[PDB]
Each structure stands twice: as C-alpha cells, then as structure tokens.
mmCIF file of C-alpha atoms in Angstrom:
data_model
loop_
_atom_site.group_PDB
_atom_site.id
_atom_site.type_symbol
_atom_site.label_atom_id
_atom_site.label_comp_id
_atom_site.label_asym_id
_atom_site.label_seq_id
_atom_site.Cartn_x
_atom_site.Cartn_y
_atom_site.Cartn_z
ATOM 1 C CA UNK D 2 -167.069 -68.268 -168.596
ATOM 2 C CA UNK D 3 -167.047 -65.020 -165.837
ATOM 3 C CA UNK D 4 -164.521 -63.878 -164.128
ATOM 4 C CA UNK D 5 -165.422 -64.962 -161.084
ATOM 5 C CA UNK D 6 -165.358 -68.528 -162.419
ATOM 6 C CA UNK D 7 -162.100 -67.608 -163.704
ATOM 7 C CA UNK D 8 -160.808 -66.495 -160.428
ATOM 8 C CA UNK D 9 -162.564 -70.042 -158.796
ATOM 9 C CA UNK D 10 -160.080 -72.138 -161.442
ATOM 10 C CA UNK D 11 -157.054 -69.792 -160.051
ATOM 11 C CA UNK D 12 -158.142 -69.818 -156.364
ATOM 12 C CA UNK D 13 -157.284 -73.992 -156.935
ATOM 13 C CA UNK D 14 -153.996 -73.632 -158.717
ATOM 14 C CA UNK D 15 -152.960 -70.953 -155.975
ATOM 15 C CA UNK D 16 -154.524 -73.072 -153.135
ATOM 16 C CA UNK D 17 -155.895 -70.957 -150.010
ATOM 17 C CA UNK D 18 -152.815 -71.402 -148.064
ATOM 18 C CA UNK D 19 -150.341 -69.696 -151.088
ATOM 19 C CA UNK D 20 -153.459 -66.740 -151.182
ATOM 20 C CA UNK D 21 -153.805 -66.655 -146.842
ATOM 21 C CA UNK D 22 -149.692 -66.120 -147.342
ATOM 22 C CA UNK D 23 -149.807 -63.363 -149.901
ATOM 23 C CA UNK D 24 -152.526 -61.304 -149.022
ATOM 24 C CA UNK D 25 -154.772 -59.842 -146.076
ATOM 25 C CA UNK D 26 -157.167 -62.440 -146.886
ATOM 26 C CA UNK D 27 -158.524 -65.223 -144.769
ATOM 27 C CA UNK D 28 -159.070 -68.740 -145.527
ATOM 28 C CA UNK D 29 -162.555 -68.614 -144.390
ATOM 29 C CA UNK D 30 -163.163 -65.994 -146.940
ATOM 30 C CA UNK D 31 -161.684 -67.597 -149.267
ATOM 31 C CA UNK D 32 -163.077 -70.671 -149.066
ATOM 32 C CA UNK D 33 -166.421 -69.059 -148.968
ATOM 33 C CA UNK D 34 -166.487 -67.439 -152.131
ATOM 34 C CA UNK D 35 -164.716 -70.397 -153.841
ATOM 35 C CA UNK D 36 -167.431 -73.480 -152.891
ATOM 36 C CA UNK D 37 -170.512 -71.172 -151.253
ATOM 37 C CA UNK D 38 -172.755 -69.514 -153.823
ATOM 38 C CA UNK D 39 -171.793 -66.003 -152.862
ATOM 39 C CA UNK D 40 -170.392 -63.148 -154.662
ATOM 40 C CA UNK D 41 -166.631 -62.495 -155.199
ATOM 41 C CA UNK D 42 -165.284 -59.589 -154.382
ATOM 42 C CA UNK D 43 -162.327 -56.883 -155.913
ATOM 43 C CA UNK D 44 -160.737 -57.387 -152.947
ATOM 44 C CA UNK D 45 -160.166 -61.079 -153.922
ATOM 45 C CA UNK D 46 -159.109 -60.490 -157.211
ATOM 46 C CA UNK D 47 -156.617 -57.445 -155.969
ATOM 47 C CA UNK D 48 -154.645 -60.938 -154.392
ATOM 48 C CA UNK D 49 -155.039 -63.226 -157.649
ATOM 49 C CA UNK D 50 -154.225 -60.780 -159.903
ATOM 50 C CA UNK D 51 -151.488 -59.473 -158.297
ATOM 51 C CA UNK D 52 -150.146 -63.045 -157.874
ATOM 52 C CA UNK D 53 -150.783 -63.991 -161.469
ATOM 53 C CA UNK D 54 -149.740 -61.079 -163.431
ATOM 54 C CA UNK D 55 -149.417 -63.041 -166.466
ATOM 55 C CA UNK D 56 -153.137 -64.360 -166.276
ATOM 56 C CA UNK D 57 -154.568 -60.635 -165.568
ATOM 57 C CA UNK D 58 -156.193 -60.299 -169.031
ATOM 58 C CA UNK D 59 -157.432 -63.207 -169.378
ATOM 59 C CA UNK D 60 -158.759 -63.293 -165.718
ATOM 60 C CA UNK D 61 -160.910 -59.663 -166.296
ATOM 61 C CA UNK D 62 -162.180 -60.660 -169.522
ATOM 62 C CA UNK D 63 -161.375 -64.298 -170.260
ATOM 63 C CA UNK D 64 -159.107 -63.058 -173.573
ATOM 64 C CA UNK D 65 -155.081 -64.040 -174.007
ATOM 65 C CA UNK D 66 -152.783 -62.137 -175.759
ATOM 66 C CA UNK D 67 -149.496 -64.179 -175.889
ATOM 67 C CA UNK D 68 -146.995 -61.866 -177.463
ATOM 68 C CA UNK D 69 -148.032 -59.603 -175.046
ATOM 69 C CA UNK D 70 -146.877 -61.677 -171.931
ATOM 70 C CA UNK D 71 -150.728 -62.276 -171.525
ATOM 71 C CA UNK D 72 -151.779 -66.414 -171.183
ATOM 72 C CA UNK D 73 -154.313 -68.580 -169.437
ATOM 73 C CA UNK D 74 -153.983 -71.775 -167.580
ATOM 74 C CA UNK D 75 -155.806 -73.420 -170.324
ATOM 75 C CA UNK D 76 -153.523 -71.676 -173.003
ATOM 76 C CA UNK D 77 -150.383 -72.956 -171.402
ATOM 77 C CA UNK D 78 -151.726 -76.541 -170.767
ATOM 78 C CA UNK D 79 -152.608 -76.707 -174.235
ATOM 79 C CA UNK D 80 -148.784 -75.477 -175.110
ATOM 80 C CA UNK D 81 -147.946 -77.895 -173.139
ATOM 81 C CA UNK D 82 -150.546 -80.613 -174.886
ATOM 82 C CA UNK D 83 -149.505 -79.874 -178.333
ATOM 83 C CA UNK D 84 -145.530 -79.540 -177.227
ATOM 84 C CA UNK D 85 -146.116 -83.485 -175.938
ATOM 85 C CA UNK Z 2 -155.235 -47.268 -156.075
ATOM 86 C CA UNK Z 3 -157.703 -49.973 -156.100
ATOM 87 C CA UNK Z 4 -159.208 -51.908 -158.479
ATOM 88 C CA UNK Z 5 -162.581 -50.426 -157.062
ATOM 89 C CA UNK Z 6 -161.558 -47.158 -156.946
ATOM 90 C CA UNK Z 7 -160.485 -47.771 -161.151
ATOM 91 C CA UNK Z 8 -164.122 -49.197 -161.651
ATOM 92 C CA UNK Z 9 -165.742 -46.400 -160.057
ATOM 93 C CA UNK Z 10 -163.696 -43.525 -162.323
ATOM 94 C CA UNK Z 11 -165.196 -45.799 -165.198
ATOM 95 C CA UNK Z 12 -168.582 -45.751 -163.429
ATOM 96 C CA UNK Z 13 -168.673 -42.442 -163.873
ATOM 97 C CA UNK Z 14 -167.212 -42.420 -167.359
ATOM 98 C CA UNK Z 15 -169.808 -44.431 -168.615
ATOM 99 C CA UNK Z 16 -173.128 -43.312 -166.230
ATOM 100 C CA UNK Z 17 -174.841 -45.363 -164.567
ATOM 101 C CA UNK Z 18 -177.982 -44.855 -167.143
ATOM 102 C CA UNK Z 19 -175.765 -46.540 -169.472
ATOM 103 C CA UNK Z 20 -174.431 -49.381 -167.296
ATOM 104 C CA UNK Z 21 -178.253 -50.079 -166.459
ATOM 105 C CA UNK Z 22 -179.086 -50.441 -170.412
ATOM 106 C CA UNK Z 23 -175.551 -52.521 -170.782
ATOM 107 C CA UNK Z 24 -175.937 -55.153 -168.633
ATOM 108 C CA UNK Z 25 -178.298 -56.844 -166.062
ATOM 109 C CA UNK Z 26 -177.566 -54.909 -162.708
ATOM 110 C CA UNK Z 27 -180.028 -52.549 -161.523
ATOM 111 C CA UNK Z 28 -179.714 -48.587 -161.006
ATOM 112 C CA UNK Z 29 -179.481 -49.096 -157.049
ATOM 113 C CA UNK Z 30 -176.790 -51.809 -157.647
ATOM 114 C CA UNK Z 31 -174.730 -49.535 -159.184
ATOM 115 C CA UNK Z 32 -175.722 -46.390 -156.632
ATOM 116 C CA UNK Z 33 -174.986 -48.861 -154.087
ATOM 117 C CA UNK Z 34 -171.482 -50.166 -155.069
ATOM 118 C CA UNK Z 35 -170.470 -46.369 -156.528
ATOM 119 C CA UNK Z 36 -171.536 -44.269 -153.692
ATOM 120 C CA UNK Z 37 -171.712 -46.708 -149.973
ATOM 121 C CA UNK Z 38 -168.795 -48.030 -148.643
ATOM 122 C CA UNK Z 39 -169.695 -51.511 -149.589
ATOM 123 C CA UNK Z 40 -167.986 -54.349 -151.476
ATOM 124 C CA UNK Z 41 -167.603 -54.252 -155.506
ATOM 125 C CA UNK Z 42 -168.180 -57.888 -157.282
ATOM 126 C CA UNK Z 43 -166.700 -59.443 -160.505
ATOM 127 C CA UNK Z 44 -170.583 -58.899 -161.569
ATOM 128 C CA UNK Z 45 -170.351 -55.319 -161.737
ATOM 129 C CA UNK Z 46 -166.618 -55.838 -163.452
ATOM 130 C CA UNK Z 47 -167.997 -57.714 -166.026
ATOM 131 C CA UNK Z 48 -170.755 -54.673 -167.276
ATOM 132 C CA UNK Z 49 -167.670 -52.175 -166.778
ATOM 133 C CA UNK Z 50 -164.960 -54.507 -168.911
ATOM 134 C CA UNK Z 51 -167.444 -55.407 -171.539
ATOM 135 C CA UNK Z 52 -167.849 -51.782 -172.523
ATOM 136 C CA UNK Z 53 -164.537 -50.805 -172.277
ATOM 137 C CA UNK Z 54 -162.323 -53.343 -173.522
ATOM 138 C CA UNK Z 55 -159.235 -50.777 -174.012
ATOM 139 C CA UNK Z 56 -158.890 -50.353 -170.694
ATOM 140 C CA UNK Z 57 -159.195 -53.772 -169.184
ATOM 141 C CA UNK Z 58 -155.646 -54.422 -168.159
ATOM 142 C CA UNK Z 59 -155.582 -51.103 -166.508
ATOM 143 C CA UNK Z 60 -158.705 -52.135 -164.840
ATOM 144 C CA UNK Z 61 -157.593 -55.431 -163.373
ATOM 145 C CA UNK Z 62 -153.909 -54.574 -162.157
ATOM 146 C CA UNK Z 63 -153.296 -50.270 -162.895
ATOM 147 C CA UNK Z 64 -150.806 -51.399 -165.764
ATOM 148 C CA UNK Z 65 -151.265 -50.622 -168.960
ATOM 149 C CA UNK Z 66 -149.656 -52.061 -172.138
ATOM 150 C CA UNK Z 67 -149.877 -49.483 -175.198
ATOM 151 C CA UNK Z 68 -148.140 -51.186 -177.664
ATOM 152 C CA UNK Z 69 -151.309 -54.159 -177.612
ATOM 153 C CA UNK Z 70 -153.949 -51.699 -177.464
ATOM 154 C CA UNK Z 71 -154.461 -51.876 -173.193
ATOM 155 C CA UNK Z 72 -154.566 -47.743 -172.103
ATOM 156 C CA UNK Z 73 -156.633 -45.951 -169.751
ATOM 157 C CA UNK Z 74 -158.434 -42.991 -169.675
ATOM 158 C CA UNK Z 75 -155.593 -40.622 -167.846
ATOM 159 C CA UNK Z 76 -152.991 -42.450 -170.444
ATOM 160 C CA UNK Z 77 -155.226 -41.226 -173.227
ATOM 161 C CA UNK Z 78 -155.802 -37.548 -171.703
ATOM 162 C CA UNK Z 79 -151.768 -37.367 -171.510
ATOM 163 C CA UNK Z 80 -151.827 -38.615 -175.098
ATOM 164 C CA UNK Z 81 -154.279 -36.397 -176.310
ATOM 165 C CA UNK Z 82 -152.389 -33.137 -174.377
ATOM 166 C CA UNK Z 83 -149.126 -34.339 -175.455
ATOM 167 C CA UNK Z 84 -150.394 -34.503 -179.038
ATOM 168 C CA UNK Z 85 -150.604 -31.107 -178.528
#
C-alpha cells in the first residue's frame, strides 16, 4: 500500500536482530519506526533494500517483475500457494 | 552514493514546483529535505517514484536493469552521447 508499509511487512520477515546485525542501525530505531506512528527514513530502507535485493522493486513502488529477478513476499507465497 | 543523495538529483530533475503540484508535500517539505541536512522519508520517495517510474530501481538500490526498462538519468545521458 506505501512503501513504508512495505518496508514494515519486511522489517518482520528480517526481524530487528537480522537488521541490528547488518546495518548501522539500532533496534530502538527500528522498532520505532516499525510499531510508533513516525516516519521512516532512507536510511532504513538503504539496510532492507540492500538485504532484499530481490524485493527492491517491489519495495519502492509496490510492482514485481519476475523475469527480471524482481518478486514480493506476497508473490512468492502465492508461488508457493498455487505450487501446493 | 545514497539513496538520498539519488532522490535529491531527481529533486532537481523534476523541480520542486512540480513535486508540489504531484503529490501532497508542501514547498518547505521539499526545501527542507533537498537543501538541510535532515532525514529523507519513504513520503517524499513515493512523489519522486511515482513520476519517474524508469528510474525506480536505480532509485532504491543504484542498479539499474536496461533490458526491463529500469535506467537512470546518467545511463540515459551515456546513451544519448553514445548514440552519437
């Protein structure tokens, strides 16, 4: 729905600790701008997206581009779904 | 390289006049965020990818992907002066 929403649904697949481990980050910043209504920053997304390079498109504008390399969470849980 | 420093160069690409008519964040917002050495938030992303949806990879991560449309204004200007 935004991309800060976007980056709320990959803060909780990451958890804080994997983002606290692979960035400058801290988990009280973090866990501000996931569950305070606050602004999120680049410098958040600079971790996420650099984590997630396969979720990048869809994380800045909420499109997927498969044969591109380019997915979602919900994209590959719905692979997933329709592979079951 | 930061994914701030990429949304300013489109800040100026675009003008702030035309951000203001493009979106809902006001002509200090954007003065603020282009020109103080403050924080930039997914909010102002979402004005900047919205108008330029070419260059949103590039935006998010500095990558671009040619081939499935993704470029960025200095990968155009090469294109453009190697096309000649």
């Amino acid at each position: 729905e935004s991309i800060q929403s976007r980056a709320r649904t990959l803060i909780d697949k990451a958890g804080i600790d994997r983002l606290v481990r692979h960035g400058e980050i801290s988990h009280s910043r973090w866990q501000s701008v996931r569950y305070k209504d606050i602004r999120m920053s680049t410098e958040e997304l600079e971790v996420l997206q650099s984590l997630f390079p396969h979720y990048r498109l869809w994380l800045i504008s909420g499109e997927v581009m498969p044969e591109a390399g380019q997915v979602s969470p919900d994209f590959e849980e719905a692979s997933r779904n329709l592979a079951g």
